[PDB]
Amino acid sequence: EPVSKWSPSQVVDWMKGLDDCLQQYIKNFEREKISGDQLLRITHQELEDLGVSRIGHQELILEAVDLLCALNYGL
Amino acid sequence: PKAVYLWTVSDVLKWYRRHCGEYTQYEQLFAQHDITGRALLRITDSSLQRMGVTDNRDREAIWREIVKQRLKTDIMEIRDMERLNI
């Protein structure tokens, strides 16, 4: 399934496979119902709004999205 | 010489003290923002600004160190990869 199709629950299952230090952000992603399409389109400002104020943490999430995006489109 | 992708925030602050030592007042921003090696490879001039390095000259000096470390990293990794071949 393309990531652009993922439901909010599928985004949360993906996040659960990421670094231990990002697990704290899962409640916010869940509350806001971030879909797969929204995740592929995610920005630094959207992460800040989702409670990710540490720039190190923003960059780990963005690194992981960039990797997911490359896989999605088979780059 | 541990590769930057493997650097902990501790390794980042050691890096900072060595190369950005004259700008010791921003050292704790890197701790507060949890800048690991992996983050250090991604941040931009804009991130530094958002983190609190508002002074342009101080920011350019730090940014120049970051770019220098990234080049060093890239070169040494190429050299390492060539030794393993392939």
Curated annotation (Swiss-Prot), chain A:
Full-protein residues shown: 6 to 80 of 1034
Cellular localization per UniProt: Cytoplasm; Membrane
Disease: Intellectual developmental disorder, X-linked, syndromic, Houge type: A disorder characterized by delayed development, intellectual disability, speech and language delay, and early-onset seizures. Carrier females may be mildly affected.
UniProt similarity note: Belongs to the CNKSR family.
Subunit record text: Interacts with RAF1, RAB2L and RAL GTPase proteins.
Domain SAM residue range list: 6-71
Protein's UniProt name: Connector enhancer of kinase suppressor of ras 2
PTM description: Phosphorylated on tyrosine.
Listed result of changing R41H: In a colorectal cancer sample; somatic mutation
The protein's role, per its UniProt record: May function as an adapter protein or regulator of Ras signaling pathways.
Curated annotation (Swiss-Prot), chain B:
Subcellular location per the Swiss-Prot or TrEMBL entry: Cytoplasm; Membrane
Domain SAM: start-end pairs: 7-72
A GO BP entry: cell surface receptor protein tyrosine kinase signaling pathway
Molecular function (Gene Ontology), one example: scaffold protein binding
Summary of the function given for this chain in its UniProt record: Required for normal photoreceptor differentiation between Ras and Raf for EGFR signaling in the eye and for mitogen-activated protein kinase phosphorylation. Probably acts together with Cnk to promote Raf activation, perhaps by recruiting an activating kinase.
Miscellaneous comment in the UniProt entry for this protein: 'Aveugle' means 'blind' in French.
Protein name: Protein aveugle
Organism: Drosophila melanogaster
